[PDB]
């Protein structure tokens, strides 16, 4: 009876754990699997807290619906009876002192192919280099750059074209809170020995088995290992492997998320839409601001207005250290500059993410390939995936974990 240990209890490890069991009980494989999680809870980046009839997503808000792996899991986990799409609306981009809106199918699918031709060279390059090469700087700075930074929390002059938009070579959630998706999995796991509050500190080789040194001192044995912990932790369990250097040299920008609850002192700004992002040249502290209510009404109790502001950006990310006070102050200080805030926030929830935004820079795919290959020839049966490899989005993480299950089995049986 072969053993497989999954390291990391976020969505990737959980996804791997869930589809691993589904496989062990459909081919009746002599496999016994266990999952180790460092923190006392499972779900990692996915955290949903409730306060005063509110539902605030400290981190992962929702997920792209077109990515099957995500809603698909929801079904298998039996939870479609909670899926709620986002309530569309207009968005804006605060340039200097003005809320401009985005511009006004077939004409769009074609305007893009004209504006953004496919890549000439086959060498990786930065998103900034790619755009700046075919559109004016002003455009990149005031429109493209603000958006991209908003969904990668990175520096576009560093981010890889190949790893973020390989194609150059509408959202769902759970009315109960994304965190339920995580809890639902933990409960439906039967053959998996889920150990929390324990961290793997070293990956090694015994005789015919792999040896996993734990926090406490216990040592587990395994024939196959799926590592889903973030680049820093992972690179630590295999510091000797030369290619692991790619993993430990990665960067994860720090960012802050601030939820705000208002009875009505909100008094809409000039315009009225889902939210907006701030352009580089704008000397603002906040990065973006979304009206949670408008998009996800089920978040805030009727009569209440729930806002969400993001802070911290690649480069100047020191704002994440200041106290809730300093943050919640800086947010309103800036927030008030484009809307009237009569009164004070009834509810306030700050939440920091120190190095939680994995950054894929130019050459990311090549380096990841080398690592996979190095691991294939020196550590057969060991696999590393997750937001640090190919895709930070929840859907992407789910299959990365699915692919891991696939590989591990092939190696073990097939
Ligand atoms: C603030 C924030 C907002 C986000 N918003 C969105 C969004 O709106 N939409 C979207 O699609 N994505 C969003 N994301 C991204 C998404 O949450 C991640 O891509 C995804 O959760 C990564 O999952 P993972 O399982 O690979 O890793 P993680 O969730 O990081 O989990 C890895 C696990 O490894 C454990 N671990 C680490 N070291 C050890 C050790 N030594 N031993 C045992 N366990 C260990 C950790 O405790 C952790 O639970 C957001 C992320 C953040 C931080
Ligand atoms: O950086 C992320 O982890 C993160 C990814 C998202 O996933 C997408 C964002 C934008 C798009 C786009 F641009 F194609 F619409 C697709 C996806 Cl899957 C959304 C939001 C965030 N975020 O940090 O706020």
Short mmCIF file of C-alpha atoms and ligand atoms in Angstrom, two decimals:
data_model
loop_
_atom_site.label_atom_id
_atom_site.label_comp_id
_atom_site.label_asym_id
_atom_site.label_seq_id
_atom_site.Cartn_x
_atom_site.Cartn_y
_atom_site.Cartn_z
CA UNK A 1 0.00 0.00 0.00
CA UNK A 2 1.86 3.08 -1.33
CA UNK A 3 1.86 6.44 0.54
CA UNK A 4 1.58 10.00 -0.83
CA UNK A 5 1.96 13.17 1.24
CA UNK A 6 0.50 16.51 0.15
CA UNK A 7 2.31 19.52 1.67
CA UNK A 8 0.19 22.63 1.97
CA UNK A 9 -3.47 22.96 2.80
CA UNK A 10 -4.47 25.81 0.52
CA UNK A 11 -6.75 25.30 -2.50
CA UNK A 12 -4.00 23.55 -4.49
CA UNK A 13 -3.32 20.94 -1.83
CA UNK A 14 -7.01 20.58 -1.05
CA UNK A 15 -7.81 20.28 -4.74
CA UNK A 16 -5.08 17.66 -5.03
CA UNK A 17 -6.37 15.89 -1.91
CA UNK A 18 -9.96 15.89 -3.11
CA UNK A 19 -9.32 14.48 -6.58
CA UNK A 20 -6.76 12.06 -5.18
CA UNK A 21 -9.39 10.38 -3.01
CA UNK A 22 -11.85 10.44 -5.87
CA UNK A 23 -9.25 8.41 -7.75
CA UNK A 24 -8.35 6.01 -4.95
CA UNK A 25 -12.03 5.04 -4.84
CA UNK A 26 -12.71 4.38 -8.51
CA UNK A 27 -9.75 2.17 -9.33
CA UNK A 28 -9.40 0.97 -5.76
CA UNK A 29 -5.67 1.74 -5.71
CA UNK A 30 -3.51 0.53 -2.77
CA UNK A 31 -2.77 4.16 -1.92
CA UNK A 32 -2.84 5.93 1.43
CA UNK A 33 -2.53 9.73 1.36
CA UNK A 34 -1.91 12.41 3.97
CA UNK A 35 -1.80 16.22 3.91
CA UNK A 36 0.38 18.43 6.15
CA UNK A 37 -0.64 22.03 6.90
CA UNK A 38 1.48 24.53 8.88
CA UNK A 39 -1.21 26.95 10.07
CA UNK A 40 -4.10 25.69 12.31
CA UNK A 41 -6.61 26.04 9.43
CA UNK A 42 -6.86 24.91 5.80
CA UNK A 43 -7.61 27.17 2.85
CA UNK A 44 -4.54 29.38 2.93
CA UNK A 45 -5.06 32.57 0.91
CA UNK A 46 -8.81 31.86 0.87
CA UNK A 47 -10.26 33.46 4.02
CA UNK A 48 -13.86 34.62 4.58
CA UNK A 49 -14.89 36.41 7.79
CA UNK A 50 -18.35 37.55 8.88
CA UNK A 51 -19.16 40.55 11.10
CA UNK A 52 -22.51 42.27 11.65
CA UNK A 53 -24.34 40.46 8.86
CA UNK A 54 -21.40 41.25 6.59
CA UNK A 55 -19.39 38.84 4.42
CA UNK A 56 -15.94 40.21 3.77
CA UNK A 57 -13.39 38.32 1.66
CA UNK A 58 -10.05 39.30 3.18
CA UNK A 59 -8.39 38.01 0.07
CA UNK A 60 -9.81 35.96 -2.81
CA UNK A 61 -12.98 37.70 -3.83
CA UNK A 62 -14.36 35.42 -6.56
CA UNK A 63 -13.19 33.41 -9.57
CA UNK A 64 -13.40 33.54 -13.38
CA UNK A 65 -16.34 31.41 -14.49
CA UNK A 66 -14.99 30.49 -17.94
CA UNK A 67 -12.31 28.42 -16.20
CA UNK A 68 -14.07 25.06 -15.84
CA UNK A 69 -11.83 23.63 -13.10
CA UNK A 70 -13.32 26.14 -10.65
CA UNK A 71 -17.11 25.82 -11.01
CA UNK A 72 -16.58 22.14 -11.85
CA UNK A 73 -15.10 21.49 -8.39
CA UNK A 74 -18.11 23.29 -6.91
CA UNK A 75 -20.39 20.70 -8.53
CA UNK A 76 -18.37 17.66 -7.48
CA UNK A 77 -18.37 19.18 -4.00
CA UNK A 78 -22.13 19.60 -4.36
CA UNK A 79 -22.58 23.34 -3.88
CA UNK A 80 -24.00 24.79 -7.11
CA UNK A 81 -26.90 25.92 -4.91
CA UNK A 82 -24.78 28.90 -3.82
CA UNK A 83 -23.19 30.13 -7.03
CA UNK A 84 -23.83 33.82 -7.59
CA UNK A 85 -22.31 35.83 -10.43
CA UNK A 86 -21.14 39.41 -10.13
CA UNK A 87 -23.62 42.20 -10.76
CA UNK A 88 -22.04 44.04 -13.68
CA UNK A 89 -21.59 47.78 -13.68
CA UNK A 90 -19.44 50.55 -15.13
CA UNK A 91 -15.85 51.05 -13.99
CA UNK A 92 -13.50 54.03 -14.01
CA UNK A 93 -9.84 55.00 -13.96
CA UNK A 94 -8.83 57.93 -11.79
CA UNK A 95 -6.08 59.64 -13.75
CA UNK A 96 -5.18 62.89 -11.97
CA UNK A 97 -8.25 64.69 -10.71
CA UNK A 98 -10.92 63.06 -12.90
CA UNK A 99 -12.91 59.83 -13.03
CA UNK A 100 -12.76 58.75 -16.69
CA UNK A 101 -14.64 55.59 -17.70
CA UNK A 102 -13.43 52.68 -19.87
CA UNK A 103 -14.11 53.27 -23.61
CA UNK A 104 -17.35 52.39 -25.39
CA UNK A 105 -18.14 41.95 -29.85
CA UNK A 106 -16.57 41.34 -33.25
CA UNK A 107 -15.55 45.00 -33.31
CA UNK A 108 -13.87 44.42 -29.94
CA UNK A 109 -12.39 40.99 -30.69
CA UNK A 110 -11.00 42.71 -33.80
CA UNK A 111 -9.90 46.03 -32.30
CA UNK A 112 -7.63 44.07 -29.96
CA UNK A 113 -6.03 41.95 -32.72
CA UNK A 114 -5.25 45.20 -34.52
CA UNK A 115 -4.04 47.14 -31.48
CA UNK A 116 -2.11 44.29 -29.87
CA UNK A 117 -0.56 42.12 -32.64
CA UNK A 118 0.95 38.77 -31.70
CA UNK A 119 4.55 38.74 -30.43
CA UNK A 120 7.35 39.03 -33.00
CA UNK A 121 10.26 37.28 -31.20
CA UNK A 122 9.83 34.01 -29.31
CA UNK A 123 11.95 35.22 -26.38
CA UNK A 124 10.16 36.19 -23.20
CA UNK A 125 9.71 39.91 -22.52
CA UNK A 126 7.98 42.18 -20.03
CA UNK A 127 4.34 43.21 -20.40
CA UNK A 128 5.55 46.81 -20.34
CA UNK A 129 7.97 46.20 -23.18
CA UNK A 130 5.27 44.35 -25.15
CA UNK A 131 2.63 47.11 -24.86
CA UNK A 132 4.92 50.09 -25.06
CA UNK A 133 6.17 48.63 -28.32
CA UNK A 134 2.78 48.76 -30.01
CA UNK A 135 0.79 51.48 -28.22
CA UNK A 136 1.66 54.88 -26.73
CA UNK A 137 3.29 55.29 -23.32
CA UNK A 138 0.47 57.52 -22.10
CA UNK A 139 -1.98 54.69 -22.74
CA UNK A 140 0.10 52.10 -20.87
CA UNK A 141 0.57 54.42 -17.88
CA UNK A 142 -3.00 55.68 -17.52
CA UNK A 143 -4.94 52.57 -18.52
CA UNK A 144 -3.16 49.24 -19.06
CA UNK A 145 -0.64 49.63 -16.23
CA UNK A 146 -3.33 50.50 -13.59
CA UNK A 147 -5.43 47.49 -14.52
CA UNK A 148 -2.61 44.91 -14.66
CA UNK A 149 -1.07 46.09 -11.40
CA UNK A 150 -4.56 45.62 -10.00
CA UNK A 151 -4.61 41.87 -10.65
CA UNK A 152 -0.96 40.84 -10.11
CA UNK A 153 0.13 43.54 -7.69
CA UNK A 154 3.31 43.75 -9.67
CA UNK A 155 5.62 45.88 -11.77
CA UNK A 156 4.66 45.56 -15.46
CA UNK A 157 8.22 46.31 -16.49
CA UNK A 158 9.17 43.09 -14.70
CA UNK A 159 6.18 40.77 -15.23
CA UNK A 160 6.52 38.16 -17.99
CA UNK A 161 4.43 38.34 -21.15
CA UNK A 162 4.86 34.63 -21.71
CA UNK A 163 3.69 33.66 -18.21
CA UNK A 164 0.75 36.01 -17.84
CA UNK A 165 -0.70 36.19 -21.36
CA UNK A 166 0.71 33.19 -23.25
CA UNK A 167 -1.96 33.85 -25.87
CA UNK A 168 0.14 36.63 -27.48
CA UNK A 169 2.66 34.02 -28.56
CA UNK A 170 -18.34 36.96 -15.58
CA UNK A 171 -17.23 35.98 -12.04
CA UNK A 172 -18.70 33.50 -9.55
CA UNK A 173 -18.59 33.03 -5.78
CA UNK A 174 -20.45 31.27 -3.01
CA UNK A 175 -23.19 33.35 -1.37
CA UNK A 176 -21.89 31.92 1.91
CA UNK A 177 -18.35 33.14 1.30
CA UNK A 178 -15.53 31.57 -0.73
CA UNK A 179 -14.14 30.07 2.47
CA UNK A 180 -17.03 27.61 2.51
CA UNK A 181 -15.60 25.98 -0.63
CA UNK A 182 -12.53 25.23 1.48
CA UNK A 183 -14.39 23.89 4.51
CA UNK A 184 -16.62 21.73 2.32
CA UNK A 185 -13.55 19.93 1.03
CA UNK A 186 -12.03 19.33 4.47
CA UNK A 187 -15.24 17.62 5.52
CA UNK A 188 -15.54 15.45 2.40
CA UNK A 189 -11.99 14.08 2.83
CA UNK A 190 -12.11 10.56 4.27
CA UNK A 191 -8.96 8.62 3.37
CA UNK A 192 -6.72 11.64 3.93
CA UNK A 193 -4.93 12.09 7.25
CA UNK A 194 -5.10 15.89 7.51
CA UNK A 195 -2.45 17.19 9.91
CA UNK A 196 -2.57 20.88 10.71
CA UNK A 197 -0.34 23.11 12.81
CA UNK A 198 2.63 21.19 11.44
CA UNK A 199 5.11 22.32 8.83
CA UNK A 200 7.42 20.20 6.68
CA UNK A 201 10.92 21.59 7.03
CA UNK A 202 12.97 19.16 4.96
CA UNK A 203 12.49 16.81 2.02
CA UNK A 204 15.01 14.00 1.76
CA UNK A 205 15.53 10.41 0.68
CA UNK A 206 15.61 7.39 3.02
CA UNK A 207 16.26 4.03 1.42
CA UNK A 208 13.48 3.45 -1.07
CA UNK A 209 11.25 6.15 0.42
CA UNK A 210 11.32 9.92 0.71
CA UNK A 211 11.77 11.31 4.21
CA UNK A 212 9.83 14.38 5.36
CA UNK A 213 11.25 16.11 8.42
CA UNK A 214 8.51 17.88 10.34
CA UNK A 215 8.39 20.88 12.63
CA UNK A 216 7.98 18.87 15.83
CA UNK A 217 10.60 16.27 14.88
CA UNK A 218 8.40 13.49 13.51
CA UNK A 219 9.50 12.10 10.16
CA UNK A 220 6.99 10.88 7.58
CA UNK A 221 7.70 8.46 4.74
CA UNK A 222 6.33 8.66 1.24
CA UNK A 223 6.75 7.23 -2.23
CA UNK A 224 5.43 10.36 -3.93
CA UNK A 225 5.21 13.98 -2.71
CA UNK A 226 3.10 16.87 -3.99
CA UNK A 227 4.47 20.17 -2.65
CA UNK A 228 2.02 23.06 -2.85
CA UNK A 229 3.54 25.52 -0.38
CA UNK A 230 4.62 29.04 -1.65
CA UNK A 231 7.97 29.52 -3.36
CA UNK A 232 9.83 30.58 -0.18
CA UNK A 233 8.73 27.59 1.92
CA UNK A 234 9.20 25.08 -0.90
CA UNK A 235 12.67 26.33 -1.82
CA UNK A 236 13.54 25.69 1.82
CA UNK A 237 12.68 22.00 1.86
CA UNK A 238 15.07 21.30 -1.03
CA UNK A 239 17.73 24.00 -0.72
CA UNK A 240 20.45 21.79 -2.19
CA UNK A 241 18.93 21.27 -5.66
CA UNK A 242 20.59 23.81 -7.99
CA UNK A 243 17.38 24.69 -9.89
CA UNK A 244 15.58 25.42 -6.64
CA UNK A 245 17.38 28.75 -6.70
CA UNK A 246 14.79 29.97 -9.23
CA UNK A 247 12.15 29.32 -6.61
CA UNK A 248 13.90 31.11 -3.75
CA UNK A 249 14.74 34.17 -5.83
CA UNK A 250 11.10 34.79 -6.68
CA UNK A 251 9.29 37.83 -5.29
CA UNK A 252 5.84 38.10 -3.77
CA UNK A 253 4.77 41.73 -3.44
CA UNK A 254 2.99 42.84 -0.24
CA UNK A 255 -0.48 44.23 -0.38
CA UNK A 256 -3.24 45.36 1.99
CA UNK A 257 -7.00 44.87 1.76
CA UNK A 258 -9.37 47.20 3.70
CA UNK A 259 -13.12 46.60 3.97
CA UNK A 260 -15.41 49.43 5.12
CA UNK A 261 -19.02 49.50 6.28
CA UNK A 262 -21.24 52.57 5.98
CA UNK A 263 -24.88 53.13 7.06
CA UNK A 264 -25.35 55.78 4.39
CA UNK A 265 -22.73 58.42 5.08
CA UNK A 266 -21.56 57.11 1.72
CA UNK A 267 -23.28 59.69 -0.49
CA UNK A 268 -22.22 58.45 -3.93
CA UNK A 269 -19.44 60.21 -5.79
CA UNK A 270 -20.15 62.07 -9.03
CA UNK A 271 -20.51 58.91 -11.14
CA UNK A 272 -21.81 55.54 -10.00
CA UNK A 273 -20.39 52.16 -10.97
CA UNK A 274 -18.75 49.00 -9.66
CA UNK A 275 -15.43 50.62 -8.80
CA UNK A 276 -12.21 52.17 -10.07
CA UNK A 277 -8.41 51.99 -10.20
CA UNK A 278 -5.83 54.76 -9.77
CA UNK A 279 -3.34 55.67 -12.48
CA UNK A 280 0.40 55.77 -11.71
CA UNK A 281 0.81 59.52 -11.99
CA UNK A 282 -1.81 60.37 -9.35
CA UNK A 283 0.06 60.46 -6.03
CA UNK A 284 -2.62 58.37 -4.28
CA UNK A 285 -2.13 55.83 -1.50
CA UNK A 286 -4.98 53.48 -2.40
CA UNK A 287 -4.58 51.41 -5.56
CA UNK A 288 -8.20 50.63 -6.32
CA UNK A 289 -11.63 50.78 -4.73
CA UNK A 290 -14.63 48.58 -5.41
CA UNK A 291 -18.26 48.87 -4.31
CA UNK A 292 -18.74 45.36 -2.94
CA UNK A 293 -22.54 45.86 -2.65
CA UNK A 294 -23.04 46.65 -6.31
CA UNK A 295 -21.09 43.57 -7.43
CA UNK A 296 -22.02 41.21 -4.60
CA UNK A 297 -25.11 42.51 -2.80
CA UNK A 298 -25.24 39.35 -0.70
CA UNK A 299 -22.10 40.68 0.98
CA UNK A 300 -23.54 43.63 2.87
CA UNK A 301 -26.88 43.90 4.75
CA UNK A 302 -29.43 46.06 2.91
CA UNK A 303 -29.23 49.75 3.81
CA UNK A 304 -25.50 49.30 4.31
CA UNK A 305 -22.74 50.19 1.86
CA UNK A 306 -19.65 47.95 1.83
CA UNK A 307 -16.53 49.33 0.18
CA UNK A 308 -13.18 47.65 -0.54
CA UNK A 309 -9.91 49.48 -1.04
CA UNK A 310 -6.54 48.05 -2.00
CA UNK A 311 -3.20 49.48 -0.92
CA UNK A 312 0.47 48.76 -1.53
CA UNK A 313 2.18 48.31 -4.87
CA UNK A 314 5.38 46.82 -6.31
CA UNK A 315 8.21 49.05 -5.10
CA UNK A 316 6.58 51.20 -2.42
CA UNK A 317 4.83 48.62 -0.23
CA UNK A 318 5.79 49.94 3.21
CA UNK A 319 2.19 51.08 3.74
CA UNK A 320 1.39 47.50 4.81
CA UNK A 321 3.24 47.95 8.12
CA UNK A 322 1.42 50.99 9.52
CA UNK A 323 -1.26 50.21 12.11
CA UNK A 324 -4.94 49.66 11.27
CA UNK A 325 -5.33 53.27 12.35
CA UNK A 326 -2.77 54.61 9.88
CA UNK A 327 -4.22 52.41 7.14
CA UNK A 328 -7.93 53.03 7.73
CA UNK A 329 -6.97 56.73 7.99
CA UNK A 330 -4.96 56.82 4.78
CA UNK A 331 -7.75 55.00 2.94
CA UNK A 332 -10.45 57.52 3.95
CA UNK A 333 -8.02 60.43 3.50
CA UNK A 334 -7.77 59.41 -0.17
CA UNK A 335 -11.22 57.91 -0.50
CA UNK A 336 -12.81 61.23 0.51
CA UNK A 337 -11.02 63.00 -2.35
CA UNK A 338 -13.51 61.52 -4.85
CA UNK A 339 -16.71 61.15 -2.84
CA UNK A 340 -18.27 62.50 0.33
CA UNK A 341 -18.01 60.40 3.46
CA UNK A 342 -20.46 61.92 5.92
CA UNK A 343 -19.72 60.17 9.19
CA UNK A 344 -17.45 57.28 10.11
CA UNK A 345 -17.20 53.60 9.09
CA UNK A 346 -19.55 51.51 11.21
CA UNK A 347 -17.55 48.35 10.39
CA UNK A 348 -13.81 48.16 9.67
CA UNK A 349 -11.65 45.19 8.64
CA UNK A 350 -8.03 45.57 7.61
CA UNK A 351 -5.96 42.56 6.52
CA UNK A 352 -2.32 42.37 5.42
CA UNK A 353 -0.66 40.05 2.89
CA UNK A 354 3.08 40.39 3.20
CA UNK A 355 4.48 38.29 0.43
CA UNK A 356 1.40 36.81 -1.03
CA UNK A 357 1.44 38.08 -4.59
CA UNK A 358 3.76 35.77 -6.56
CA UNK A 359 5.56 37.66 -9.31
CA UNK A 360 6.27 35.91 -12.63
CA UNK A 361 9.06 37.86 -14.29
CA UNK A 362 10.51 37.49 -17.79
CA UNK A 363 11.92 33.98 -18.16
CA UNK A 364 9.58 32.54 -15.53
CA UNK A 365 8.44 29.64 -17.74
CA UNK A 366 11.97 28.56 -18.65
CA UNK A 367 13.12 28.58 -15.04
CA UNK A 368 10.05 26.63 -13.94
CA UNK A 369 10.70 24.08 -16.71
CA UNK A 370 14.28 23.57 -15.57
CA UNK A 371 13.04 23.04 -12.04
CA UNK A 372 10.43 20.51 -13.14
CA UNK A 373 13.06 18.72 -15.19
CA UNK A 374 15.70 18.84 -12.45
CA UNK A 375 13.12 17.37 -10.06
CA UNK A 376 12.15 14.73 -12.65
CA UNK A 377 15.69 13.40 -12.92
CA UNK A 378 16.90 13.84 -9.31
CA UNK A 379 13.65 13.53 -7.36
CA UNK A 380 11.27 11.27 -9.30
CA UNK A 381 7.81 11.22 -7.74
CA UNK A 382 8.17 14.70 -6.24
CA UNK A 383 6.09 17.48 -7.71
CA UNK A 384 5.88 21.19 -7.00
CA UNK A 385 2.91 23.28 -8.18
CA UNK A 386 0.69 26.08 -6.99
CA UNK A 387 0.41 29.83 -7.35
CA UNK A 388 4.21 30.07 -7.56
CA UNK A 389 4.36 28.03 -10.77
CA UNK A 390 1.77 28.37 -13.52
CA UNK A 391 -1.11 30.57 -12.57
CA UNK A 392 -2.08 32.44 -9.45
CA UNK A 393 -5.82 32.31 -10.12
CA UNK A 394 -7.94 29.87 -8.08
CA UNK A 395 -9.01 27.98 -11.19
CA UNK A 396 -5.36 27.64 -12.35
CA UNK A 397 -4.39 26.38 -8.90
CA UNK A 398 -7.12 23.76 -8.92
CA UNK A 399 -5.88 22.03 -12.05
CA UNK A 400 -2.24 22.52 -11.12
CA UNK A 401 -3.23 20.34 -8.20
CA UNK A 402 -5.23 18.08 -10.50
CA UNK A 403 -2.25 17.68 -12.80
CA UNK A 404 -0.16 16.91 -9.75
CA UNK A 405 -2.53 14.04 -8.85
CA UNK A 406 -2.26 12.80 -12.41
CA UNK A 407 1.56 12.81 -12.45
CA UNK A 408 1.89 11.25 -9.00
CA UNK A 409 -0.33 8.33 -10.01
CA UNK A 410 1.36 7.76 -13.36
CA UNK A 411 4.66 7.58 -11.47
CA UNK A 412 3.21 5.29 -8.77
CA UNK A 413 1.16 2.86 -10.83
CA UNK A 414 0.66 3.39 -14.56
C1 LIG B 1 -5.23 39.09 -0.52
C2 LIG B 1 -5.42 38.12 -1.65
C3 LIG B 1 -6.52 38.25 -2.51
C4 LIG B 1 -6.74 37.37 -3.58
N1 LIG B 1 -7.87 37.51 -4.39
C5 LIG B 1 -8.11 36.61 -5.44
C6 LIG B 1 -9.28 36.72 -6.25
O1 LIG B 1 -10.13 37.61 -6.06
N2 LIG B 1 -9.46 35.79 -7.25
C7 LIG B 1 -8.55 34.74 -7.52
O2 LIG B 1 -8.77 33.94 -8.43
N3 LIG B 1 -7.42 34.64 -6.74
C8 LIG B 1 -7.21 35.54 -5.72
N4 LIG B 1 -6.06 35.39 -4.93
C9 LIG B 1 -5.13 34.25 -5.26
C10 LIG B 1 -5.53 32.92 -4.68
O3 LIG B 1 -6.01 33.12 -3.38
C11 LIG B 1 -4.30 32.00 -4.70
O4 LIG B 1 -3.81 31.80 -6.03
C12 LIG B 1 -4.52 30.58 -4.15
O5 LIG B 1 -5.20 30.59 -2.91
C13 LIG B 1 -3.18 29.87 -3.98
O6 LIG B 1 -3.51 28.61 -3.43
P1 LIG B 1 -2.44 27.57 -3.00
O7 LIG B 1 -3.22 26.44 -2.47
O8 LIG B 1 -1.51 27.24 -4.14
O9 LIG B 1 -1.55 28.24 -1.91
P2 LIG B 1 -1.85 28.83 -0.48
O10 LIG B 1 -3.27 29.19 -0.38
O11 LIG B 1 -0.82 29.86 -0.31
O12 LIG B 1 -1.62 27.63 0.54
C14 LIG B 1 -0.33 27.01 0.74
C15 LIG B 1 -0.38 26.39 2.15
O13 LIG B 1 0.90 25.93 2.49
C16 LIG B 1 0.97 25.91 3.89
N5 LIG B 1 2.38 25.69 4.28
C17 LIG B 1 3.45 26.53 4.07
N6 LIG B 1 4.59 26.04 4.54
C18 LIG B 1 4.25 24.83 5.07
C19 LIG B 1 5.02 23.83 5.71
N7 LIG B 1 6.32 23.91 5.92
N8 LIG B 1 4.36 22.71 6.15
C20 LIG B 1 3.00 22.60 5.95
N9 LIG B 1 2.21 23.51 5.34
C21 LIG B 1 2.88 24.60 4.92
C22 LIG B 1 0.39 27.28 4.21
O14 LIG B 1 0.09 27.50 5.57
C23 LIG B 1 -0.77 27.36 3.26
O15 LIG B 1 -2.01 27.01 3.84
C24 LIG B 1 -5.81 36.28 -3.82
C25 LIG B 1 -4.69 36.14 -2.96
C26 LIG B 1 -4.49 37.04 -1.88
C27 LIG B 1 -3.28 36.85 -0.98
O1 LIG B 2 -3.74 38.57 -8.42
C1 LIG B 2 -4.65 37.79 -8.24
O2 LIG B 2 -4.45 36.67 -7.51
C2 LIG B 2 -5.99 38.03 -8.81
C3 LIG B 2 -6.40 37.20 -9.89
C4 LIG B 2 -7.66 37.37 -10.49
O3 LIG B 2 -8.01 36.52 -11.57
C5 LIG B 2 -8.23 37.17 -12.83
C6 LIG B 2 -8.12 38.60 -13.03
C7 LIG B 2 -8.35 39.19 -14.29
C8 LIG B 2 -8.69 38.41 -15.40
C9 LIG B 2 -8.94 39.10 -16.77
F1 LIG B 2 -8.08 40.23 -16.91
F2 LIG B 2 -8.67 38.22 -17.84
F3 LIG B 2 -10.28 39.55 -16.84
C10 LIG B 2 -8.80 36.98 -15.24
C11 LIG B 2 -8.57 36.37 -13.96
CL1 LIG B 2 -8.70 34.64 -13.78
C12 LIG B 2 -8.54 38.40 -10.00
C13 LIG B 2 -8.14 39.23 -8.94
C14 LIG B 2 -6.87 39.09 -8.32
N1 LIG B 2 -6.51 40.04 -7.18
O4 LIG B 2 -5.43 39.98 -6.60
O5 LIG B 2 -7.30 40.91 -6.83
#
